[PDB]
Symmetry: C3
Subunit: 416 residues, 3 copies
Amino acid sequence: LKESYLEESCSTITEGYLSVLRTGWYTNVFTLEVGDVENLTCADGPSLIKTELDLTKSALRDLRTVSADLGVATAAAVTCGVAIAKCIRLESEVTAIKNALKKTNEAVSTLGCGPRVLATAVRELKDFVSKNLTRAINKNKCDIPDLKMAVSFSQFNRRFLNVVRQFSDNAGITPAISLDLMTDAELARAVSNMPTSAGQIKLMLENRAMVRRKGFGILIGVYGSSVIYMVQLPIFGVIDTPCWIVKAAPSCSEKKGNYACLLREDQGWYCQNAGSTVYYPNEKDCETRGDHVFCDTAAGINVAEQSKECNINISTTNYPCKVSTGRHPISMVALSPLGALVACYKGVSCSIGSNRVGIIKQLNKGCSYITNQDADTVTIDNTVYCLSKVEGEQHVIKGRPVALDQVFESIENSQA
Amino acid sequence: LKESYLEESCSTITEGYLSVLRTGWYTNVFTLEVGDVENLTCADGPSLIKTELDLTKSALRDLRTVSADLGVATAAAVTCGVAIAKCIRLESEVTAIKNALKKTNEAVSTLGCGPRVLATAVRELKDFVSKNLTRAINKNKCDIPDLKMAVSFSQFNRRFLNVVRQFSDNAGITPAISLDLMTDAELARAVSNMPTSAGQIKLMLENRAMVRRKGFGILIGVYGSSVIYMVQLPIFGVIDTPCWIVKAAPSCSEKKGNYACLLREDQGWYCQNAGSTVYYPNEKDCETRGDHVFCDTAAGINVAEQSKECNINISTTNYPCKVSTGRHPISMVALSPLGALVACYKGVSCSIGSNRVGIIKQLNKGCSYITNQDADTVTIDNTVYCLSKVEGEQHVIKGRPVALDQVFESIENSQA
Amino acid sequence: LKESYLEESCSTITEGYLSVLRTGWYTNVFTLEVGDVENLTCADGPSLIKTELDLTKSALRDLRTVSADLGVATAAAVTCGVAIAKCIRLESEVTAIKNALKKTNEAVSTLGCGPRVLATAVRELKDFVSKNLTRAINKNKCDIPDLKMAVSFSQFNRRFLNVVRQFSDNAGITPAISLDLMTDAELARAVSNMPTSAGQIKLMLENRAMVRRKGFGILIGVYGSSVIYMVQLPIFGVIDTPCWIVKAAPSCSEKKGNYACLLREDQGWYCQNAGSTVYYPNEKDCETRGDHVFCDTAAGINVAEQSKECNINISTTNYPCKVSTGRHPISMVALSPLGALVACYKGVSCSIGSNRVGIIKQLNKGCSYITNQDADTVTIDNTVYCLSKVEGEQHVIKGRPVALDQVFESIENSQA
């Protein structure tokens, strides 16, 4: 909640973060009973209930014609998911978990390889198909005067049909959990049943939309009158360790109308997990929510603890800070948590504006750091960048503005 | 509508374009009245209307469990969008705009920070919930013999449920405007109310599907019986300035079975806006529609006016034309507006075919330029490239085929 | 089904593949009859059937307000698709194919430019609109006591409305075929009608979900009471030629706490088609299904047959094997078909685990090759990588671990 501007490097650092680290996967297997619906037929000619039965059977048979045979964390995670659809048909665990879920609509159970996985039953469609609807469909009569029967049917199989749309349209693995895959109460029962300490399950529950976004779904298959799928939910088994984030902007010097520029390439996320610092170089591997930060940890890299020497004595530091270099001039804005680093050079015009006072001042050629208490908006030409009004303490560390040590090594080698 | 082939560089230039430049964002805030639907309950056991009420209340409460806390133009644009959802709950402007939209279903109004934003009301669901439906749900009786009441209910809340699907499934920010977020008449009222000159609003209206594609949606929140969302629509405030587009293909020379190749890296879009030339290096930042070109301008870079010297005297030119170089042979086709540059080298076979005459001739090893009046199709091996039949005048500029001046500087440095 | 581990290069090769090569596009044009539905109006005030008619007419008119004007294979393919929507409105082939599909609901016919394209009719909505429904809507009376009429209407136009959602939401070109664009029976009739030999159509039919994923849809337009769209289905006209796939992992050597590392950059897919070897460098250009491999061939590059000399004598080989080089240490796992190459260096811990025995052993610093019969899982720190249990024969080829010859050329040039 305390941000430091490195005057010496035209850069920012943002501190004060709590990890929410994805360390594992929780499997919520759902079983949707459709019922013995294949052995029902409408022979009283064309009918609305007949059209719904033919639609239901066509979507079900279309799902029975379905068969299977990236940033790093997700690929290791998918290898997990495949492992669980496999061990499922294994030893017909179906038969086992089937016996286990007749008894109840929600239960915990160790799978052949599964370490006590979650099983949730949704049987409304079979009971309706079996009880109310199948008695009205005995004797092959569907143009019944009971129009109520047709409307209950299209409403109750709607969840299954959209479920079929969601599985047929995405070739078996949705990237997240829709409210039709798992409602919120079922989502909450599954999130609540995860194996971690109290603060982690409670915190994951709060922001359960992130559990939705970071999880995904796998088709297991159709067996008779049973619909089977599984949802992989990220277990954020690690919370409240230090994280901090690093931003940087181009440092350019001009002599005689010509430019020499350099830029730090160590932007992105850093976290202190298990005695090492993990770098999440891409934005998408981590995600902020207020003061808490959600990261998939398998997406990070163990880097040496050496990054604080990149702030204190960056030229003279022992680990070589990686940088790139350039020969022709640029201009841009890298927005920061409590401001913006604005590199505004000849050829562009930059300004800061206020939602209360209007444009305050055009901003200077060179590297400038602007605070989000200072301005409400920044503009470069016609590109508009507005800014947040979030509060916290900011600080300036005075100093004059391939591995960077390979740039010093390249210059130093060419002159002797 | 006049294309020039640069024989001297194996390259094309396409001229004759009218800008449609995204210069701003128009905010269309929608208010969907759901009604006082929470205080209705069905106590006459399980029912179709009860299931619809429980579904409606579950989707609404699921949306009440929703909370928040890339090519450059879009990120600056999102900072806008966040600014507007913030200033909305501010000073409960809700209460203000609420007072303002009771009076009418469509109106203009300055927001606390909003410079006269658009407000659109859609109240059908509350009035139905309140008038026809709530009187039939008094006294907690839902298995009524009026089946008409249940069908009007599922049809009228369908817009809200798909609206809920669209907001719950995308974690609050859709990338575009579906016909369920904003119908065409509401889309047209909002596009029509934008702040620019007549030719721009009329032209944006024509191709309003691009306004759909370039805009996006933000969830604001649920308050009581009111549903609130906002749609950011791009204001293409700039039209009919010169744009032109540059394509290039590999120029390869062979000696003794060995290749030396070079390629211009200045492909992409160029526009003359406000005294500078803006380069849109990625295709997606600009989009053609006939003779008009749609660009998001915040996606471009002010480059010096020096690019025409890259055509006249490219080796000797003063700004250094950026190029890359290579040592091992390749082969490819870069399709152009009125043809194709085909670099066809040893190892591949290339041909042009006609939909009328069939294969005309196999095309030559080397760099060839083919016109879309010349052929209907071009093939390299089994990769098929067909071509358009669009008309306009083509011209050949005769000439023998890191910054390119850094390639001349590198060769020139190594021999003395 | 026989995998070779190159001990000499810390690398894997997987052999035993059957091509399923996308060599062409099959066009399935669908014609959906909506009926003369515009000339029907409901004047008996507000009604459910009236709301459905107004919705249907609003979605239809919204689709009448729709107008148009990447990894390489797809872009050449889209130029195909555009060619076919063009030649369609040409010579009003509509009128021709219209005459041709009155006679039947499915037929083959050469288009003006089309080489005998497929036409499929779906007319249920017009016949219902015309026969049962239009007689009940004569005399402008929609609040009829027949509630059955309203439910048949919303069910029958549902396919058209979701069809409209799918076309309005994606700006006219879906990336694949939903079950609502083409049901499985229509999908099967179209796949079955493709121009190739028996083994190819039969095999494509098996895994028709890949035909779905690799095809896409194009809006042609609305004319009166006729809905028109086309689906481009990939014709995998080539099957059962040799393919093989190459993986590699970093080879690192340490001296005095310092690292020198190199890595082969020739990972990806290789196929023997038409006398040349085609390289599919990106995963997405090819896709495995068991022992068969699905590739879009226009996505590949003709490379010289020289790659087997990259295995036998890679340092001394004549074509220069492309490699990159590095100066600072890394650590990672590249999973393989029958195992994993695990480069585990100082700073990380790696292990293999078993679903039966538990963690077997922590894995060694250095380059290790682990078989999927050997372990069920591998872990680096907290990043979990599990593994498959697929069977086949593995083999080790003993040997001590820019173009690679440019790395030998760079070292060799700097010392003399």
